[PDB]
């Protein structure tokens, strides 16, 4: 229940290119590296010899493959992916010792989806059916797993910022965090949606209507590199960070329009403030806060990209946030747990923190309605 030695360190990645897990599909098993994404709900894998791919799903070689005779098309601002739906037997070698029949989208055509030079060939959507394509009747992988086996309905992620981490399926491993876990309610089961109730730059409040911290929505997404903030919030966030760091920078840097560079080991972390997000707690009028460092929002590419950016889809707590914490996707109890990661990067002066309880009133007002 609190120990899963087989699953520790089962994630790999490259900075900026997400985290992937090894999976097998079909009989006999075809091994594939699969992007772990809590911000989507489709299990989709390369199914054709696209030049960027090390390997791909070869349906003809699998005796357990079943055609669903239906296509799916997933557009993005940039490009897209499109594929043919089927089901096959699925395992996770460094995961629970089970095999499940799952929906799989065999990707036959894509644009700006696969990355030139990456070691992954598909995507594992870990969120809920509501945002699955083409519709909510296509059961996501994790639902299928829970329905078909005795695996408990939760998973946890330790992302360590080349890069590594752990995906514990069906439980929590207490060696992956220190201190206590703090839980925030899943507002609605589609994305992993939560509510931010207060934001502090260097222990100083932004004094904004908290309804806008979640303008549209706030989600926990392992497929996004950045901490992403709603336009109005990003505007005020930058402004405060800008004035907090008036110790030493181009204008385009703050909009992600260019990079900023320093000499090896001369990176000024201390001229940058800590950032605290207060999340809604499990108890009426009770919240807690998570605190990340510039280590998190200044991502190396010594040249670094400012890892905070504006959005029209709301707040996104991506790898910037997640790399500081052990994160528990407690689906059975409709809540997300946060604790200090036993692997997060810090200095001798400041470390990542999860603290509570705090008294916060009108937290429901922070939740934006359709
Ligand atoms: N939710 C999609 C996450 C994603 C990001 C980048 C990429 O190339 C493919 C997928």
UniProtKB/Swiss-Prot annotation:
It is found in: Cell membrane; Golgi apparatus, trans-Golgi network; Endoplasmic reticulum; Endosome. N-Glycosylated. Addition of a bisecting N-acetylglucosamine by MGAT3 blocks lysosomal targeting, further degradation and is required for maintaining stability under stress conditions. Acetylation by NAT8 and NAT8B is transient and deacetylation probably occurs in the Golgi. Acetylation regulates the maturation, the transport to the plasma membrane, the stability and the expression of the protein. One of its GO terms (cellular component) is neuronal cell body. Expressed at high levels in the brain and pancreas. In the brain, expression is highest in the substantia nigra, locus coruleus and medulla oblongata. GO terms for molecular function: amyloid-beta binding; aspartic-type endopeptidase activity; beta-aspartyl-peptidase activity; endopeptidase activity; enzyme binding; peptidase activity; protein serine/threonine kinase binding. Residues 1-370 are extracellular. Disulfide bonds join 160-343, 210-366, 261-303. Its EC number is 3.4.23.46. The modification N6-acetyllysine is found at residues 70, 207, 211, 217, 231-232, 239. Keywords: Acetylation, Aspartyl protease, Cell membrane, Cell projection, Cytoplasmic vesicle, Disulfide bond, Endoplasmic reticulum, Endosome, Glycoprotein, Golgi apparatus, Hydrolase, Isopeptide bond, Lipoprotein, Lysosome, Membrane, Palmitate, Phosphoprotein, Protease, Signal, Transmembrane, Transmembrane helix, Ubl conjugation, Zymogen. The active site is at residues 37, 221. GO terms for biological process: amyloid fibril formation; amyloid precursor protein catabolic process; amyloid-beta formation; amyloid-beta metabolic process; cellular response to amyloid-beta; cellular response to copper ion; cellular response to manganese ion; detection of mechanical stimulus involved in sensory perception of pain. Inhibited by RTN3 and RTN4. DXXLL motif is required for a proper endocytosis and retrograde transport to the trans-Golgi network, as well as for regulation of lysosomal degradation. Responsible for the proteolytic processing of the amyloid precursor protein (APP). Cleaves at the N-terminus of the A-beta peptide sequence, between residues 671 and 672 of APP, leads to the generation and extracellular release of beta-cleaved soluble APP, and a corresponding cell-associated C-terminal fragment which is later released by gamma-secretase. Cleaves CHL1. Belongs to the peptidase A1 family. This is Beta-secretase 1. It comes from Homo sapiens.
């Amino acid at each position: 229940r609190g120990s899963f030695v087989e699953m520790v360190d089962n994630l790999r990645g490259k900075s900026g290119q997400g985290y992937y897990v090894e999976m097998t599909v079909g009989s006999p098993p075809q091994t594939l590296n699969i992007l772990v994404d809590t911000g989507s709900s489709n299990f989709a894998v390369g199914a054709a010899p696209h030049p960027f791919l090390h390997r791909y799903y070869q349906r003809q070689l699998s005796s357990t493959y079943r055609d669903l005779r239906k296509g799916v098309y997933v557009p993005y601002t940039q490009g897209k992916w499109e594929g043919e739906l089927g089901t096959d037997l699925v395992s996770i070698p460094h995961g629970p010792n089970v095999t499940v029949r799952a929906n799989i989208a065999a990707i036959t055509e894509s644009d700006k989806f696969f990355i030139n030079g990456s070691n992954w060939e598909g995507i594992l959507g870990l969120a809920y059916a509501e945002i699955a394509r083409p519709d909510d009747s296509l059961e996501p992988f994790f639902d299928s797993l829970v329905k078909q086996t005795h695996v408990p309905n939760l998973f946890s992620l330790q992302l360590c910022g080349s890069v590594g981490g752990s995906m514990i399926i069906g439980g929590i491993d207490h060696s992956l965090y220190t201190g206590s876990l703090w839980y925030t309610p899943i507002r609605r089961e589609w994305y992993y949606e939560v509510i931010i109730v207060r934001v502090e730059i260097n222990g100083q409040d932004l004094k904004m209507d908290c309804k806008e911290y979640n303008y549209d929505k706030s989600i926990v997404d392992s497929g996004t590199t950045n901490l992403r903030l709603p336009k109005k919030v990003f505007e005020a966030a930058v402004a405060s960070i800008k004035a907090a760091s008036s110790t030493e920078f181009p204008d385009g840097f703050w909009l992600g329009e260019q990079l900023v560079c320093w000499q090896a080991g001369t990176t000024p972390w201390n001229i940058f403030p800590v950032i605290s997000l207060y999340l809604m707690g499990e108890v009426t009028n009770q919240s807690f806060r998570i605190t990340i460092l510039p280590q998190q929002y200044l991502r190396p590419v010594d040249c670094y990209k400012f890892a905070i950016s504006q959005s029209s889809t709301g707040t996104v707590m991506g790898a910037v946030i997640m790399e500081g914490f052990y994160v528990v996707f407690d689906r059975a109890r409709k809540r997300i747990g946060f604790a200090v990661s036993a692997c997060h990067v810090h200095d001798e002066f400041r470390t990542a923190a999860v603290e509570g309880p705090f008294v916060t009133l009108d937290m429901e007002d922070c939740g934006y309605n359709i």
